[PDB]
Symmetry: C4
Subunit: 388 residues, 4 copies
Amino acid sequence: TYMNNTEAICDVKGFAPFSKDNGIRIGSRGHIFVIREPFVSCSPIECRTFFLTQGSLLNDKHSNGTVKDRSPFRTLMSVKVGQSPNVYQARFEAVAWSATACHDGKKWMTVGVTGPDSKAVAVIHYGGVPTDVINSWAGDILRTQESSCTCIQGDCYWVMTDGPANRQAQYRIYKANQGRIIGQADISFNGGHIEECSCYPNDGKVECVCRDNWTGTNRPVLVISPDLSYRVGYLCAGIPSDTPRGEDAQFTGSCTSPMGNQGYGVKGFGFRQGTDVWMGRTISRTSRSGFEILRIKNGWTQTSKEQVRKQVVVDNLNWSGYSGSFTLPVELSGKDCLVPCFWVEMIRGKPEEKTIWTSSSSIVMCGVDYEIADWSWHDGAILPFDID
Amino acid sequence: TYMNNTEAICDVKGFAPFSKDNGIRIGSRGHIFVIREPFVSCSPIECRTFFLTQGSLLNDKHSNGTVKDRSPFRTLMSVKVGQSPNVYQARFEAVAWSATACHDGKKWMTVGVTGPDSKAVAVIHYGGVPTDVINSWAGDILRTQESSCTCIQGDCYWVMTDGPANRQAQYRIYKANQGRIIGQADISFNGGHIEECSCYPNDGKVECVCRDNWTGTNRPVLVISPDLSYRVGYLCAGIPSDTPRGEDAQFTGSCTSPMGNQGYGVKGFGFRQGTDVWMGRTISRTSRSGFEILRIKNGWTQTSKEQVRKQVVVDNLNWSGYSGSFTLPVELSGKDCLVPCFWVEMIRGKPEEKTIWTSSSSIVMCGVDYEIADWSWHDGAILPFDID
Amino acid sequence: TYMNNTEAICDVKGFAPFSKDNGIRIGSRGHIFVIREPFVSCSPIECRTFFLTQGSLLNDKHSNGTVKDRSPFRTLMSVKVGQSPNVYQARFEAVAWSATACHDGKKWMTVGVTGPDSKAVAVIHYGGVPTDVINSWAGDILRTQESSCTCIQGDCYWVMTDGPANRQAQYRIYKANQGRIIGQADISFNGGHIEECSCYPNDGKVECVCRDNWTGTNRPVLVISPDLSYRVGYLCAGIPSDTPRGEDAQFTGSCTSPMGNQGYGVKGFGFRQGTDVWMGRTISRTSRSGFEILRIKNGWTQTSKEQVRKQVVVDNLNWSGYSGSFTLPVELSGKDCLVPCFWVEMIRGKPEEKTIWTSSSSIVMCGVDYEIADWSWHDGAILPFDID
Amino acid sequence: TYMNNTEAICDVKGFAPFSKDNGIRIGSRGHIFVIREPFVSCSPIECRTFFLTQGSLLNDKHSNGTVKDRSPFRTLMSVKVGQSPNVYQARFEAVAWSATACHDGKKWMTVGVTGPDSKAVAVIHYGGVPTDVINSWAGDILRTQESSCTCIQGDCYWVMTDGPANRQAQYRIYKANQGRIIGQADISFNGGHIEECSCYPNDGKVECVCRDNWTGTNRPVLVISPDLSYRVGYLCAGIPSDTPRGEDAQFTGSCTSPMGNQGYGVKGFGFRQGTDVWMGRTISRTSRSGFEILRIKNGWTQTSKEQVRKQVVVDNLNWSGYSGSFTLPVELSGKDCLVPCFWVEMIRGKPEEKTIWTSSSSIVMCGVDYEIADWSWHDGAILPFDID
Ligand SMILES: CCC(CC)O[C@@H]1CC(C(=O)O)=C[C@H](n2cc(C(C)(C)O)nn2)[C@H]1NC(C)=O
Ligand SMILES: CCC(CC)O[C@@H]1CC(C(=O)O)=C[C@H](n2cc(C(C)(C)O)nn2)[C@H]1NC(C)=O
Ligand SMILES: CCC(CC)O[C@@H]1CC(C(=O)O)=C[C@H](n2cc(C(C)(C)O)nn2)[C@H]1NC(C)=O
Ligand SMILES: CCC(CC)O[C@@H]1CC(C(=O)O)=C[C@H](n2cc(C(C)(C)O)nn2)[C@H]1NC(C)=O
Ligand SMILES: [Ca+2]
Ligand SMILES: [Ca+2]
Ligand SMILES: [Ca+2]
Ligand SMILES: [Ca+2]
């Protein structure tokens, strides 16, 4: 039976911890995949952590990282949420240097992307077997969310980006039933830039938070109805949610256009509470260190700067990174709504630390109806390892 | 279907061994979690061993133990009873520096506790996904059993402690259905101190044995009816069941109040045989070395000193530690009653041994209708390891 | 539903290989349990390999073997047939320095034995939870088969030995339904000695082949009807099936009494083909080197010396050891009979080799209706390992 | 229920990647089986990777490879497609130095081959338990596909070769229901040589592509109707699909007889698109380096040289090896046809590289209705390892 996901996002006052896998700490002696870009999606029975590999291990010479990023040794694997990405608990998903994965009630539909950048290919597995494919339409680095995709009523929706990373690129919306592509749509958002979207189900539509690697220190926002009609723009909030960014006060904000004349970005998430927003960001405005999350009143609909709450999960004394969204099925939480949960990546090693490798651990948090305290649940490992 | 647990405790004449995992022996070469505070609960299909991690491994530098105890790297994981807590057989349960876990017939309800000590948070997972939360009400080290919780007819009951460890603290009783808190109650036991309760189902009520870290070398006792009405006090027995303690003869005992003017404690268990008690304790009265268990006649209802039986499981030549209670489901043992089974932790390393780490192995015993012989099933490993 | 096992043994002309786990070869780098006394039983869905542990690993210091044999660190674990006994694929069964395990159609009933030799205890687990116990009746090393037990129609039968190993001891027959002992019987076989029986289902009865560690180079034989009435004696065959033994020609044989004035023994198996026997033995008559199996015509009913076939599985250039019996469920093989299959242990290290440890690998063979060729499927590892 | 496999092969314009396991890269630190001859078959729920072992590990001394190839330590194990062949995720299948494995909808029927070359034995396991056997009929190296076998409507068909490798040998066709041999047939193909067939279901019949190790640089072709009536010969295409081979232009081709006066061969696959063929081969015509696949128009029925498409998967800068066929069940892909998917082995070490061992990793590709780009998904590991 198809997992409904038609209900609304739960109004939450805070986030209680879900998991922590300590893989880089475990991987000092264990057999752990050097991973990058973990993310969580849930089936109506369990939540798993996806990630990308080089087919290497921590403390190995194959973790030397000189081995490139967009590589053929790159695969998508999954483990259960909280388990580390180890060799002996991993489930193979796809050959992938960029991915998204999602469940619809029956089977897992994964979409890993590979090939050369000129003509990259994205394969849609479903039930484990590849079912369909999407080819590079623009010929510049075909890619997708790196976070959970979204199925509503058995139809799974997601967002891909073909084009350049700095200048204007092209952005699309795909739609599948049982791993077979049933629809697609182009995103006529000009001047704007959409990357690495964090998305979720909300009142029968798909809301996705994204990253502007062109000109925006604020974050793009897409709204997707199941007929692929769309409204797009930016998170109206007067708080810069991207990184690098500037001061909150030297920032006005816009619901339509990119603000803050900085380049670059980072993957980030947001959650729409009626008219308010749960926005997440790093503490450092220039680095990826720390992580915090703020509820900004009327920040979804207005260029607001009203911080209702400010909860800290990763301290600015510690390294973080990417972040993304997902929901808890009704068939799991017991609610009448969809519990907003999220993950934060914590990057260790290169380029910041004196090592030869680059991996990440995660912490997952999810939406509660109470106020959670500020603490730091950070990575832990004591670098450099023996290999370095 | 909800696991009944309304029946009475089996009258047992002894305890036959259930398991032994030898993880610290296995972990000389294997990949084993440096754990602390293991405990056993059973579903109507299997019994699992819970424990807490630092995300470290035996023989790793991450086992250096200087890494603190109430830490963010602390998680609750489980394995099957008898299996060691290894990376490749572990199931993630919660981020936890203090825990309890229990099954009700359908899903596992875990309750791990984390955060800062000032405002610690306890998350209730159920089916794997967090379902509810309890926040620090007193602002001093929110904590819970470290042993199995108890579900009766689909409602799961447990005991938490907010306050100080030496002086008077505050003690509460929680109640859940499907991971959603449905009740709570304060414990008006003054002068008394309740920590780390070992509990069980008995005639439709929950009996919990606890630890007095204030003034008692005897053990607190709580009786919980499913409406959260309670009687509380001490195990009436004239035998000191806590550690450190004194001689049995320089001990009178009380059914209401703390006896033996020693501080500190250790986690310990007891089992009520009609009017008698199966009480467990270490052999050494000052250290945690050894383990033994005595049936004291009428010791549940009277300040008795009549040892009916004395069975030894861990010898005073060997190290032990915590201990706790649980039952076997009717859906497993085949009985008409609930088989009393228990686990003993065996601590190796710091603070007693010349190492840099601290972990534990366990042995599990359960209630038989025969007299079992005295032997020592101890830890085994030959310390220090190579890392030290 | 209860697995029938009322049918007869398949008449087989040879044995085709089932498995080989190469654990000692795998365990040069892997994480493999130093085991002793492996054996195979099958459920109506799969066959597993049982074994006993010290909680040590190959190449570990904990494999030093000075660590004794009848030890508390001794456990019974299982893996699938062909898989090695590794830490990460092992299922905990019991604390055991002597064991038997069997399935009846619904759950696994294990019987591991432990304690001190004076008052050893045998616990009956069933479904994973201990269900019943048998205590030392004679006070000298309580022990059992080390090979599969036998369930017929939901009742499981086996053979235990309390007494001395050299002189006359005492031998019993137990019977269980759902892990609860429902019957027992003493074996009034005087002068004779019964150890480590290899048993099986045959026409509604249980036939067990055993070892005479007193005075016999031939092998005891027990026949068990499900009311525990018994006929006992020796395998009538004029071929000595035990080891150490003598020449076949300096051996007459007896269907009642022990022949060949040698002491000691080894665990061994046999299979009754109507009136013939498939008897197995080592090639060396003094050491445990090699393994071969001979069909002796009318050897079950008469003191025959007619070798119908002689198949070799382990060559006399290579080390072997114990051996034992089991059947394939109809629910697996598809037959109308019960396929005779067997395992051979291959011991490496101490006492024969220049190492510090002692483990074993296995090969499994089962009954086919064709003539299989003589080859050597031996252990493989290249000793001594790095630890030595 | 029996998996139908009566439908036709999907007409495909290209192949999108299925998996990559990077075991030799993982096995720099992990526990990975030194394997040879991997292959993929799928059940109506999952696809697994089969392989053969020495019971050794990467980076072990037991990987020294001086240990021979046709050895008793040789086993057939399986893992899921994309997972590496590691000790802790492996399922034991058979003792095998040559194999085939296939699923019919209900259980796995494996056929591993062992023994001495003079009188080798092939055992048919089914459901895990050995069910039947085929003995060496010619007395020279009994062997089979090393690739997936084929079940159609519950009857499983495959191809064995008894005889010599260079000169004329003998070739047979077997047929099983539930692991019990129900039919057999001799292949009266004279002058011709058939080895290591890659086969598949196509319109109710079994088409198998093979290797000519005698005189052919082109590839034999067998067509099997379920009554074991056969047509046999060669892939009519004017393109040499074997290796070593010669130029395409110095090659005429034949639909009946072996062309290109070279000896040797390599395992290879083909797929019949109505009248066209998807033929695969290495890039190097003399070595096993590289891999590419060409659709040759009317190449199944005519000595054509019309390359419709040329897709590259492994570049000639990198090592490859064997290759073989299989299908995706309708119960997996969702199609009305049978999706043509294939695997390529990538050999590292001896005999080409400066190591002491020999293993392989794989990539799997499957049939899509789009044109896939040329990229290299190669092995990765950086040789020699530490052991060498
Ligand atoms: C901005 C979106 C893409 C465009 C190529 O760049 C991602 C940026 C980025 C970062 O550090 O911020 C890491 C991401 N990333 C992904 C990876 C691999 C290792 C290929 O998975 N390495 N880096 C970029 N995504 C790619 C290369 O496909
Ligand atoms: C007396 C109850 C608590 C109050 C903080 O102290 C526990 C005592 C204790 C011991 O050695 O006896 C070990 C327990 N403990 C638990 C832990 C960790 C590693 C945090 O799980 N370390 N020690 C204490 N529980 C805590 C700190 O939450
Ligand atoms: C003859 C039957 C028993 C009587 C104690 O002796 C077994 C003999 C034997 C051998 O080498 O032949 C190995 C068996 N054995 C078993 C074990 C352990 C390691 C205790 O499982 N070590 N050796 C003996 N069984 C025991 C000690 O319980
Ligand atoms: C040509 C078919 C057979 C005839 C013996 O030879 C296979 C050739 C071959 C190669 O390199 O091309 C590798 C194959 N092979 C297989 C193996 C083992 C390690 C026995 O599985 N080693 N090599 C050959 N098959 C055998 C020996 O049973
Ligand atoms: Ca930006
Ligand atoms: Ca105390
Ligand atoms: Ca003897
Ligand atoms: Ca050739």
